[PDB]
């Protein structure tokens, strides 16, 4: 089916599909199914066409997309403009939470950027 | 099966009897600092003093 322009297969739990968006987790998804009386073990192929439209119109009133990434990327850009210690570490691709840098800083160098993946 | 408001009447009768602070709302009154017993004199007497030589 379709939810907010994203297509999901029939053999996919709605609980896991709603969680595929940036911003939705166990709490939000759990409350979005209860709002429309969808048991957690519901699969996409069983949702009627009218309820599928309600989910799309439900997520359109929430921060479930780049709107969320913007808030995260804006918080990192503000630390860089202010000149804080935490801002330099993002640009330099180094651990930002006071971690020993003598060894094992791989994931930091790969993900710490002013433009995060999300 | 006992109303909470009716239980606090008994909890308050104990406070008046045993002289304890009655704080049903859990307000931070800093009383944890008053109950803590001083440990100054225990630490000061660590290094022995100069005695007869």
């Amino acid at each position: 089916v379709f939810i907010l322009g994203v297509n999901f297969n029939e053999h996919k739990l709605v609980q896991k599909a709603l969680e595929s968006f940036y911003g939705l987790g166990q709490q939000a998804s759990a409350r979005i199914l209860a709002k429309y009386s969808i048991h957690p073990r519901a699969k996409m192929g069983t949702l009627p066409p009218k309820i599928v439209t309600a989910l799309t119109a439900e997520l359109s009133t929430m921060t479930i997309e780049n709107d969320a990434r913007r808030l995260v990327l804006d918080n990192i850009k503000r630390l860089r403009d202010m000149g804080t210690y935490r801002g330099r570490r993002h640009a330099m691709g180094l651990p930002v939470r006071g971690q020993q840098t003598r060894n094992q800083i791989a994931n930091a160098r790969k993900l710490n950027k002013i433009e995060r993946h999300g | 099966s006992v109303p909470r408001a009716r239980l606090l009447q008994l909890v308050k009768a104990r406070c008046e009897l045993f002289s304890t602070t009655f704080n049903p709302e859990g307000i931070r009154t800093g009383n944890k600092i008053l109950r803590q017993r001083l440990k100054g004199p225990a630490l000061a007497t660590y290094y022995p003093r100069k005695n007869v030589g």
Binding site: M82, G83, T84, Y85, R88 | -
Partner: protein
Amino acid sequence: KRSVWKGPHIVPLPIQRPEPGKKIAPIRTQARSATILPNFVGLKFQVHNGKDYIDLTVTEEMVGHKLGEFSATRKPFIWGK
């Protein structure tokens, strides 16, 4: 003070507001743990980094952070020359 219920960490600072048009020198301080309150948004600070005093101009964006967060103590590690 991390826990919010007991206010922020405040240290004595000579933040005396001058008359409009007067020249006030920057405040040299070593209290690198002083929370940046809103009362001195706009004053010029000179925070100690261990060896030197790095200039700082407090703005409305820094309210809440510590003064020591704007004066790096170590120098960036760079390999080669």
